[PDB]
Amino acid sequence: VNSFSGYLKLTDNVYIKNADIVEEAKKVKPTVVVNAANVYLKHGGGVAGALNKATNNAMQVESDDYIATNGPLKVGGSCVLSGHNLAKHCLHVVGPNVNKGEDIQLLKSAYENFNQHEVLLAPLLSAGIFGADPIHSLRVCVDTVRTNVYLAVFDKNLYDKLVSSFL
Ligand SMILES: O=C(O)C[C@H]1CN(c2ncnc3[nH]c4cc(F)ccc4c23)CC2(CCC2)O1
């Protein structure tokens, strides 16, 4: 038993809700919240900008130190940093950005990072400003992640569409 509430069960291990991931994190304080990161951990907009704003820019300050030490992430890769006031840990995962020409096949590699964590609160990778089809992203998630994932979808119209079209 865990503290996530109001989710629709899609499979044995994947759950979905129309919710703002920032507010969901603030209330649940999950062990892991996933950020929709870029390789530079520049949290300017989308999910990343919203999560970073909720930490009063502490996420960005920590991320800048991480990059100064380690260099950029790989597309499809991840790193674990602090969850600040939102979660114990933040798993920063880089899905491909279709608006940068990145290979959509890397989306499966990105979701594989979730399997290192027993339970996660997450967005749909490569959705939103990353330009991928969120329905495809949901399919890859369900076919790749084996751990327990609670997906927060901000947009209500898209949520309804994701549910109604789910096979
Ligand atoms: O509607 C979606 O869920 C898909 C979109 C948006 N996203 C989010 N997912 C959950 N919570 C959110 N809160 C936000 C607050 C913002 F200011 C901006 C965006 C989000 C957001 C995920 C993405 C992929 C990156 C962008 O695509």
Swiss-Prot record:
Membrane topology: Multi-pass membrane protein
Activity modulation: Inhibited in vitro by GRL-0617.
Listed result of changing residue 31 to A: In strain: Mu/B.1.621
Domain Macro intervals: 1-167
Localization, UniProt: Host endoplasmic reticulum membrane
Catalytic activity: Thiol-dependent hydrolysis of ester, thioester, amide, peptide and isopeptide bonds formed by the C-terminal Gly of ubiquitin (a 76-residue protein attached to proteins as an intracellular targeting signal)
Cited function: Responsible for the cleavages located at the N-terminus of the replicase polyprotein. Participates together with nsp4 in the assembly of virally-induced cytoplasmic double-membrane vesicles necessary for viral replication. Antagonizes innate immune induction of type I interferon by blocking the phosphorylation, dimerization and subsequent nuclear translocation of host IRF3. Also prevents host NF-kappa-B signaling. In addition, PL-PRO possesses a deubiquitinating/deISGylating activity and processes both 'Lys-48'- and 'Lys-63'-linked polyubiquitin chains from cellular substrates.
Subunit-structure text: May form homohexamers. Interacts with N protein.
Protein name: Papain-like protease nsp3
Gene: rep
Residues of the full protein shown: 1025 to 1191 of 7096
